[model samples]
Target chain A: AWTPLEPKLITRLADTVRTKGLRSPITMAEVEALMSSPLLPHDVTNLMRVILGPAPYALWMDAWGVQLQTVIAAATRDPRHPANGQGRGERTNLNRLKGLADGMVGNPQGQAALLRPGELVAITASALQAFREVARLAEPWADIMQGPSESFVDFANRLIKAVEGSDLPPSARAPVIIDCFRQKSQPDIQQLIRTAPSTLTTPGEIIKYVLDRQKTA
Target chain B: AWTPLEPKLITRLADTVRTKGLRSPITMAEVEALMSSPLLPHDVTNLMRVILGPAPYALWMDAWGVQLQTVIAAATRDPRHPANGQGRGERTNLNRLKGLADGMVGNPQGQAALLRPGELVAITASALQAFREVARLAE
Candidate 1:
């Protein structure tokens, strides 16, 4: 990440910071202040901020961050003193989590924590396995595919092999077939050999430029 | 990264090891041996091996990882006969560096020996300006 002091490069980096930072200038400023402060080392934070920017929740969250003094001021003067709305009920998410954990949907604490050890076992284990076996058999052609990580050449070879090696019904066989010939039929003629393609042009323009133009040129 | 598992899941992981290993039964055998080993908790090296599996050279290389092995090995290696091809005569490099600092090309001995003090001071003084420039833009 170190570079010899190239003025041009420094100017470019500064320009990038200017342009990209405009999207969320406030967050970017806060990020810069935190980075420069002695409380945190610079390099690690620099990479995260430059690369990931601000995480969404953190950017809009004004009550948190380097400004905890505001939270203190707001909490101290609430008129509804008896209610812990600013405390427990304001613990906003805890109740939601408890409600979620009370249900059987994801409440592992039901069996794992409340019940005696090893007293409970999963009921759907065998059923899942049975379904998985059916799925595996349904995908009998799995071996015929090399899947996503394969090179094009390997997949092409597998494809050709699959086609050629496939079983065909014996009743479909026929005797006669169309014949094609390959021979250099150079009957005697005075001519010069030309090294050429049927046509050619720059890679992008080849499609539009045709032999009519070639003939004229 | 957490998954609920049972004996069925253990069997599935064994199947996964077989599929990835591609016809090598040794993969499953080794996995079983490691999982069932009695002394596994006592063996730190084996634990690290099992946890990390294979490391790419990129993870342990220059311009790569944190270079824990490199820095440690360099510091502890013999000064005379350095380990791991690091005996590049760093004194010679220091000489070449200083020679380039003074706008000279050759004369390794002079650069290595006595001519670098003022240059080092100049470099250190100017380095602060670079830091300031970075802070200003990072604003």
Candidate 2:
């Protein structure tokens, strides 16, 4: 009774289900075949994207969160190290979560439950990182779609926050809510309106980046 | 001192460097630029592809390598397990590297030493997340 999406779209959904909870490959295969078929003839590709919504990109974003946290975890794993002394570690964790999670990357409408777990870890780690990087992360409590960037300092705080709350996971979610109102800075278009620079690190952003290209450009 | 070489010729050089273990990003950037640049004289592109032997499809093939590997990586990155298992992880890595460094993607001579410090990582990491699907991606 369902229409097929495009082949790659089917592949994406298949991938989404298996990894990020989108749909199974077999199901996707069926859908793929269905999409290809002249019958239930809908734009299978479009159908898939519509159904997957942002989950595919979110999962991709989640992976980046994992990568980032992996970076922090690697940094902190060496406890006796003089440079990190938990201050850096803690600050790193705080800003990403409290700063970006509440204000920027999380985008207000996104929920922790929907996220993959590593994403949460990135957020928590980022909140802490933000405090270490900047004097403040512009907290006014409204939701934002991307990190604010009045300056590198503000951006750093905002980055950590965005990194923390970026589309990834749940367990890693930070407890603090970032307020988001320092000067109301405009955000970076290429870096992180919703995702990072790369695909594996920010698949959604990258994907949307290109599609938006055909749209606007 | 320098003349433009065909994209396939660049690939050959890149292969030579990879085998030698001189991996450098700058090297690959040069190779890629040479391939992308339309400034080359027709003689060089022809000499490299026809005389030395890479083929017209080489450039497009490499592009496919970039696009394919990215899709696989994007689809694979594991969220639940902590050990870190990206989509189609090792196999994809190997295939991607092969496709990018030697297989479908061309340039066996010019970009030697640069494309292989795991350049596919950059390609996959960037392209996979972008959303072209096969139709758009294949192109």
Best by DockQ: 1
Query: What fraction of the true interface contacts does model 1 reproduce?
Result: 0.00
Candidate 2 Cα errors over 4 Å, as ranges: A1-53, A78-90, A94-217, B1-139
A32-130 in candidate 2: lDDT tens per residue? 333322221013223433544464544433443454566567656765332134455333342343324433353332433233234344443332233
Question: Model 1 off-target regions past 4 Å?
Answer: A1-18, A21-61, A64-217, B1-68, B79-139
Candidate 2 true-interface contact recovery: 0.00
* Residue-by-residue lDDT tens digits, candidate 1, B25-55: 5543444454442221112112222221121
- Model 2, residue A41: distance off in Å is 38
TM-score of each: 0.16, 0.18
- lDDT tens digits by residue: candidate 1, A1-217: 2212234423443454454342322223223322221111122223333433354223322212222233223334653322124444442121221222233224443423432111111112212222223222322112454343543223333443333223323232110000000011021100111223443222111211221132231
Model 2 over residues B1-139: C-alpha lDDT tens digits? 2233332344345454435422244434544444443221222223222211111122323444565455556545543222124443433343434434343344433333333333434343333222123223312
**Candidate 1: C-alpha lDDT:** 0.27
